[PDB]
Design an enzyme around this catalytic site. Structure first.
Site, PDB file in Angstrom:
ATOM      1  N   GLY A 158       0.771  -1.233   0.000  1.00  0.00           N
ATOM      2  CA  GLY A 158       0.000   0.000   0.000  1.00  0.00           C
ATOM      3  C   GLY A 158       0.806   1.290   0.000  1.00  0.00           C
ATOM      4  O   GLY A 158       0.268   2.345  -0.313  1.00  0.00           O
ATOM      5  N   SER A 159       2.084   1.214   0.366  1.00  0.00           N
ATOM      6  CA  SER A 159       2.948   2.383   0.350  1.00  0.00           C
ATOM      7  C   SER A 159       3.447   2.587  -1.075  1.00  0.00           C
ATOM      8  O   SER A 159       4.281   3.459  -1.323  1.00  0.00           O
ATOM      9  CB  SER A 159       4.168   2.167   1.243  1.00  0.00           C
ATOM     10  N   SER A 209       7.327   4.012   4.839  1.00  0.00           N
ATOM     11  CA  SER A 209       7.226   2.894   5.768  1.00  0.00           C
ATOM     12  C   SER A 209       6.841   3.407   7.150  1.00  0.00           C
ATOM     13  O   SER A 209       7.584   4.163   7.760  1.00  0.00           O
ATOM     14  CB  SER A 209       8.562   2.179   5.859  1.00  0.00           C
ATOM     15  N   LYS A 210       5.691   2.986   7.658  1.00  0.00           N
ATOM     16  CA  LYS A 210       5.247   3.496   8.944  1.00  0.00           C
ATOM     17  C   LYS A 210       6.210   3.200  10.077  1.00  0.00           C
ATOM     18  O   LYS A 210       6.552   4.104  10.848  1.00  0.00           O
ATOM     19  CB  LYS A 210       3.854   2.999   9.320  1.00  0.00           C
ATOM     20  N   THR A 211       6.655   1.947  10.162  1.00  0.00           N
ATOM     21  CA  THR A 211       7.550   1.509  11.238  1.00  0.00           C
ATOM     22  C   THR A 211       8.998   1.798  10.898  1.00  0.00           C
ATOM     23  O   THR A 211       9.883   1.711  11.755  1.00  0.00           O
ATOM     24  CB  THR A 211       7.445   0.002  11.468  1.00  0.00           C
ATOM     25  N   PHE A 212       9.244   2.126   9.642  1.00  0.00           N
ATOM     26  CA  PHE A 212      10.591   2.369   9.179  1.00  0.00           C
ATOM     27  C   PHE A 212      11.532   1.198   9.384  1.00  0.00           C
ATOM     28  O   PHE A 212      12.735   1.396   9.436  1.00  0.00           O
ATOM     29  CB  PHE A 212      11.191   3.671   9.727  1.00  0.00           C
ATOM     30  N   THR A 213      10.999  -0.021   9.488  1.00  0.00           N
ATOM     31  CA  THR A 213      11.865  -1.193   9.536  1.00  0.00           C
ATOM     32  C   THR A 213      11.435  -2.240   8.532  1.00  0.00           C
ATOM     33  O   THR A 213      11.978  -3.336   8.498  1.00  0.00           O
ATOM     34  CB  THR A 213      11.972  -1.823  10.937  1.00  0.00           C
ATOM     35  N   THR A 214      10.433  -1.925   7.732  1.00  0.00           N
ATOM     36  CA  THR A 214      10.045  -2.821   6.653  1.00  0.00           C
ATOM     37  C   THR A 214      11.310  -3.247   5.912  1.00  0.00           C
ATOM     38  O   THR A 214      12.034  -2.398   5.377  1.00  0.00           O
ATOM     39  CB  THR A 214       9.120  -2.075   5.669  1.00  0.00           C
ATOM     40  N   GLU A 216      12.141  -4.963   2.932  1.00  0.00           N
ATOM     41  CA  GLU A 216      12.423  -4.674   1.542  1.00  0.00           C
ATOM     42  C   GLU A 216      12.538  -3.169   1.287  1.00  0.00           C
ATOM     43  O   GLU A 216      13.414  -2.733   0.549  1.00  0.00           O
ATOM     44  CB  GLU A 216      11.473  -5.410   0.590  1.00  0.00           C
ATOM     45  N   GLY A 271      -2.662   0.063   5.161  1.00  0.00           N
ATOM     46  CA  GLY A 271      -1.795   0.305   4.023  1.00  0.00           C
ATOM     47  C   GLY A 271      -2.526   0.332   2.698  1.00  0.00           C
ATOM     48  O   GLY A 271      -2.279   1.194   1.863  1.00  0.00           O
ATOM     49  N   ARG A 272      -3.438  -0.614   2.505  1.00  0.00           N
ATOM     50  CA  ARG A 272      -4.183  -0.690   1.265  1.00  0.00           C
ATOM     51  C   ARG A 272      -5.248   0.398   1.211  1.00  0.00           C
ATOM     52  O   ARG A 272      -6.091   0.414   0.313  1.00  0.00           O
ATOM     53  CB  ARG A 272      -4.801  -2.089   1.089  1.00  0.00           C
ATOM     54  N   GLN A 353      -5.175  -5.859  -4.664  1.00  0.00           N
ATOM     55  CA  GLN A 353      -4.704  -5.794  -3.282  1.00  0.00           C
ATOM     56  C   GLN A 353      -5.807  -5.349  -2.323  1.00  0.00           C
ATOM     57  O   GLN A 353      -5.968  -5.919  -1.250  1.00  0.00           O
ATOM     58  CB  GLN A 353      -3.491  -4.878  -3.101  1.00  0.00           C
ATOM     59  N   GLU A 357      -6.540  -8.479   0.012  1.00  0.00           N
ATOM     60  CA  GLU A 357      -5.890  -8.449   1.299  1.00  0.00           C
ATOM     61  C   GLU A 357      -6.900  -8.124   2.410  1.00  0.00           C
ATOM     62  O   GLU A 357      -6.742  -8.551   3.530  1.00  0.00           O
ATOM     63  CB  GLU A 357      -4.678  -7.512   1.313  1.00  0.00           C
ATOM     64  N   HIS A 388      -8.151  -8.318 -26.051  1.00  0.00           N
ATOM     65  CA  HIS A 388      -7.374  -9.115 -26.995  1.00  0.00           C
ATOM     66  C   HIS A 388      -6.530 -10.182 -26.359  1.00  0.00           C
ATOM     67  O   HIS A 388      -5.761 -10.833 -27.041  1.00  0.00           O
ATOM     68  CB  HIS A 388      -6.542  -8.227 -27.916  1.00  0.00           C
ATOM     69  N   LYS A 518       6.872 -14.320   6.456  1.00  0.00           N
ATOM     70  CA  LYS A 518       7.989 -13.540   6.952  1.00  0.00           C
ATOM     71  C   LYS A 518       8.835 -14.339   7.936  1.00  0.00           C
ATOM     72  O   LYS A 518      10.057 -14.332   7.866  1.00  0.00           O
ATOM     73  CB  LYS A 518       7.520 -12.229   7.582  1.00  0.00           C
TER      74      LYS A 518
END
EC number: 5.3.1.9
Lengths: 557, 557
Positions: A158-159, A209-214, A216, A271-272, A353, A357, A388, A518
């Protein structure tokens, strides 16, 4: 499971078992000249009209009544208020669900934990605007004193998909803005190929990133930062090229970003459902804040429509119940979304999504294991590309596939005096007319005869030329695809997802299904370093890992 | 409808009825350490290895035996030879199906209507190579003497997707080639947003169209021409900026294209199997003829594999029968394609066309209406992108969804000392591990208890944390995604599709489903002209038409 125990639901399933098969769109239209009038909805937003034509659906007045009853008996109205009022309906996480507050242009107090959340919503928007002003106007300068030409959003789920879909949908509204780029895949080619087209001295990164630790996202952010530093040598310059949509100020500071460039959002923002928040920054930067405000107002418009409109005339609810009908009665696994609009080429991916989700769930709000179907597999491609690729199966396969056809009456590119758009519109109308009409044996035989086929030739071709039709669709036509209309459209589908969730008694706003993947991936990560074989999992996981180690060494041509 | 009459088919169904629900992935692996060894396949192509691991499928040695017996009793092998021998297996259209001839590197003669087609295949190939040399080297010039920087492919369906997908997939192999662009939608924004990015002086257009009268393609081709002539102005200039993939020499010349630059292909080349023919001119232009020849070789290698390998270890066959199992016994409506590879972002979209348009059928070769399911709905997005969009539904929704997971061991961009790919692999392996293993109620409880949850808090959340697992997947790993491997992978799925079609006794090679829509669109076109209300269709089609007429003149504020 509430649904299955609901008498209105039971009445609905019994009727279908008894009468469902006997419904035939062609007969229904041939018999009832008021069908379009009875099963259509016209919404004047005062900024363009949205026509919802659900008349080519396998329904009668009797079916719509049973559906509307079920929505009533499933409590969608009260659940709706609970959402809009800030109650913590996200039951499993004990949280509010207030994407509607993000676009709340009326600023009516919505209170959570004792405080009106609105002032916070607005502080952030005001903040986004001020920054967006600094960047677009050329006021904001890179480390070498040059204006910003490229904005690069780094995020997952969602980000990412929201800002990306919206900016692509709203291209025409991007004059004066910098180019936007979207990085999301952990796969290094995504960041490599983006970075290769950039100049560090004029590129501005947004880490979403909300938590800033995501994992990827932060991994991608760090690669971008090392790429930047190769040129800028000086770490103090990072603050000029990297901003953050996050809540984790410590982690943000640590990365090198000035904490005044941290734009906050809240836990009641899924997020979505985040594009309307600080997550929309790249949208605002690309098309300006006036347009971003039009996007929010469009969403706000649909929100009021969902809230104040009797169910019988409620777009989002009518949409949802039609879906329930096809999912819980006809048993259709999928829902196709087909916008006849190239700009909208990721519209379907976005709702894949949003819907999946949110409603790919199997546990009810009471802890009961669902004993009926929930969310459908959402999919699609814009018309006429999709037309097509896969419509063959839609017209002549062995599956019932409810389709939503969408289009703007006015195109952003009226090239050739309206030629492309005329052909486009004709196809949008013809496809749904085809799906419902079909072509009978007799009708096809006649064509074969008139075309000069021999009896033998006719005999072999005949069956393959028959279209059984009776394939239901929704047509959604709107005056033009402006920021406002796009806003209303996205919100309309958001609320459709909400209603289905309420009817199914699941929680559309959590996502516990991501946890297992995860944790398992964390275990595997370090097992990948080194030459020796892994024997700690199932034989497949083990074999796959060992094949990777063996072949990573291989020199290939 | 013979599949249904087939005794092997019957035994398979009867067995599934009695034992299908009993199959538990986790239990199979727990009770057989050889499962992986027994249910996987390694392919050495001499140009990279391909691991097909189908062990995470709901299947036992007994089930496979049953599936192969079926492939046998349905004449898979003979149909296969029939295709390879040039027989008219496309029965409705009375044509050969010879995309394998296009990639026939052995040059073994394949005769149609009394003549080997190989020499014609190779003539066009030679011709493709010469022009490609002339363009890439700078020899070929524009009307002002500039060399070509941009090559624009214009076409629909198979004249577009294959080339778009392959060039996206093989980007790293394009050092030295011009930029390629793909225009397919009739919607005007498509060509217009493309043209805005080009210089007419150094732009080469490729109009891909067998008959050269394909309405949307030709419409785009004309808009392009007209745009080129706004600057170049002399009509004779068209010939240096437009070439054609067609057989309609007259219509080509009439457009202004020089017939010497008309690259040909045949009836026996299906659109959805055309990228290997002249249709891949843009591929060859982008990555050079050598790589293009590597691509056809990869497909040829897979063709040979399909032709010489006993069913038991025949990849495409295994893939085909596995799908039959899920489609015809489990009743699964869809099949997911999830490449953990951003270069492959359009891979799933490609097969959505190649599968659904081949197999979305309901009439068999003998004219009977099928009474069993047919082609599945194909969908997907590359991981981890898709993982962050819709995997929630796959893990915890109410639908069984067969997934193919694909990944190259070696990445094209080994940045940050391989950190990105490492994580990508971990997620690739972890997701299938997860779908198979799940997490039980008891395991979930220990976790929650370990997290210090109160009995009430644990209870309310517990079932939501449970993963039922038992979700079957294929894992396809290959050394590196090179032109050769890619071609192999494409052909693999091509033959999977072919094998399913045979089992269903349908004609994977025609596409009669397109006519109705085409017919009905041409009727509507002229009616769109004007302000007179239309009355000649069902009330919905009219209603839509009238709303369109009504809103085309709405000023929007």
């Amino acid at each position: 499971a509430a649904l299955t125990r609901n008498p209105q639901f039971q009445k609905l399933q019994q009727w279908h078992r008894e009468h469902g098969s006997e419904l035939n769109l062609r007969h229904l239209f041939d018999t009832d000249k008021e069908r379009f009038n009875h099963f259509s909805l016209t919404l004047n937003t005062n900024h363009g009209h949205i026509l919802l034509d659900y008349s080519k659906n396998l329904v009668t007045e009797e079916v719509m009544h049973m559906l509307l009853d079920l929505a009533k008996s499933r409590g969608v109205e009260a659940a709706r208020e609970s959402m809009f009022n800030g109650e913590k309906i996200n039951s499993t996480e004990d949280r509010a669900v207030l994407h509607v507050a993000l676009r709340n242009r009326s600023n009516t107090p919505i209170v959570v934990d004792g405080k009106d959340v609105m002032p916070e919503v607005n502080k952030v928007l005001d903040k986004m605007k001020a920054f967006c002003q600094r960047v677009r106007s050329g006021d904001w300068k890179g480390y070498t004193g040059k204006t910003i030409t490229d904005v690069i959003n780094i995020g997952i789920g969602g980000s990412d998909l929201g800002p990306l879909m919206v900016t692509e949908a709203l291209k025409p509204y991007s004059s004066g803005g910098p180019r936007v780029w979207f990085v999301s895949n952990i796969d290094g080619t995504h960041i490599a190929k983006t970075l290769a087209c950039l100049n560090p001295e004029s590129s501005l990164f947004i880490i979403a990133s909300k938590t800033f630790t995501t994992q990827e996202t932060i991994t991608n952010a760090e690669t971008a930062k090392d790429w930047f530093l190769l040129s800028a040598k000086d770490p103090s310059t990072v603050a000029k090229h990297f901003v953050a949509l996050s809540t984790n100020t410590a982690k943000v500071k640590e990365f090198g970003i000035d904490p005044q460039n941290m734009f906050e959002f809240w836990d009641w923002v899924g997020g979505r459902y985040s594009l309307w928040s600080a997550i929309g920054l790249s949208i605002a930067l690309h098309v300006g804040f006036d347009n971003f405000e039009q996007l929010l107002s469009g969403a706000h418009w649909m929100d009021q429509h969902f809230r104040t409109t009797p169910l019988e005339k409620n777009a989002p609810v009518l949409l949802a119940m039609l879906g329930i009908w096809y999912i819980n009665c006809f048993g259709c696994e999928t829902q196709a979304v087909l916008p006849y609009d190239q700009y909208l080429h990721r519209f379907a991916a976005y709702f894949q999504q949003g819907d999946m989700e949110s409603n790919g769930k199997y546990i009810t709000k009471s802890g009961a294991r669902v004993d009926h179907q929930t969310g459908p597999i959402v999919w699609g491609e814009p018309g006429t590309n999709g037309q097509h690729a896969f419509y063959q199966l839609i017209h002549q396969g062995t599956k019932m596939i409810p389709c939503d056809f969408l289009i703007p009456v006015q195109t952003q590119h009226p090239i050739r005096k309206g030629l492309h758009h005329k052909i486009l519109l004709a196809n949008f109308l013809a496809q749904t007319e085809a799906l419902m009409k079909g072509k009978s044996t007799e009708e096809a035989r006649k064509e074969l005869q008139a075309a000069g086929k021999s009896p033998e030739d006719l005999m072999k071709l005949l069956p393959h030329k028959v279209f059984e039709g009776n394939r239901p669709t929704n047509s959604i036509v709107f005056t033009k695809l402006t920021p406002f209309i796009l806003g209303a459209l996205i919100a309309m589908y958001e609320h459709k997802i909400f209603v289905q969730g309420v009817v199914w008694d699941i929680n559309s706003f959590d996502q516990w299904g991501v946890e297992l993947g995860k944790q398992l991936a964390k275990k595997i990560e370090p097992e990948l370093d080194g030459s020796s074989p892994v024997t700690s999992h199932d034989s497949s996981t083990n074999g796959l890992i060992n094949f990777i180690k063996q072949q990573r060494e291989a020199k290939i041509q």
